[PDB]
């Protein structure tokens, strides 16, 4: 009953961080407060827009 609209793989070819888990955890505290503004914007979108496809940008 419709189309499950999915984004093309083009916009999914975004640079991904290549670091082991401990690297994230070690600098997690020094990462959260210093990159909060985009992090909050994305996760606000996740809870507000409620749809994964909306917060791709």
């Amino acid at each position: 009953p419709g189309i499950v609209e999915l984004p093309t793989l083009e916009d999914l070819k975004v640079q991904e961080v290549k670091v082991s888990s401990s690297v994230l955890k070690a600098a997690a505290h020094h990462y959260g407060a210093q990159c909060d503004k985009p992090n909050k914007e994305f996760m606000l979108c996740r809870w507000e827009e409620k749809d994964p496809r909306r917060c791709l940008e």
Binding site: M43, R46, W47, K50, P52
Partner: protein
Amino acid sequence: DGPEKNYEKTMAILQIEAEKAELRLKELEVRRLMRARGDGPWYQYPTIDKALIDHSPKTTPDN
């Protein structure tokens, strides 16, 4: 007493019975009607109140 008493009194008896008779016929029709459609005061079978809904943000965005 005079026949007027019995005449008028029986007229009231007929008036009361007629209204009662037509009301019962209406009652069976309405009861049938609103049982089916359901858009009536009675026969409103219980549902779940919307108040018991947690609108607080969950731990997962997809909600």
